[PDB]
Amino acid sequence: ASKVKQDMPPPGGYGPIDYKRNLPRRGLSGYSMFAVGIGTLLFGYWSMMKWNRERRRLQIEDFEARIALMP
């Protein structure tokens, strides 16, 4: 006596279902990456230049200590 009941889609329809490819760009330019790399290299070069010059001075100092102690 009751209404026919069955598994049916809701009145209207269903919400849209996405299927298309979605790969966002999500990246920097090539120039920016290359510039960051070159700047990092230059900073490291300058720091290591100072450090190695100081190390050469220290090495000369201890070599002179040896020279003084040798006789």
Binding site: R53, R56, R57, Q59, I60, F63, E64, I67, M70
Partner: protein
């Protein structure tokens, strides 16, 4: 002018690795000849006293040889301190 430009564009499009390798190699070859600090590197290598400095027998005719390490004569490393 334009032929080499197109060749370099094609190389950058197809073989960036080889382009970078050749650029780095060329820079490494040519830049040291134009640097003013190469002589400083040579002098730093020369200024390292690996062995004992043997003193010279004084004969009264060496005005440019010190008689004590703290005497003003002889080489100076003041340039190295400020470098």
């Amino acid at each position: 002018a334009g032929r080499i430009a197109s060749f370099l564009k094609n190389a950058w499009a197809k073989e960036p690795v080889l382009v970078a390798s050749f650029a780095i190699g060329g820079l490494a070859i040519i830049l040291p000849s134009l640097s003013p600090y190469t002589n400083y590197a040579i002098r730093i290598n020369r200024a390292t006293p690996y062995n004992y400095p043997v003193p010279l027998r004084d004969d009264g005719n060496m005005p440019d040889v010190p008689s004590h390490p703290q005497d003003p004569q002889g080489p100076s490393l003041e340039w190295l301190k400020n470098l």
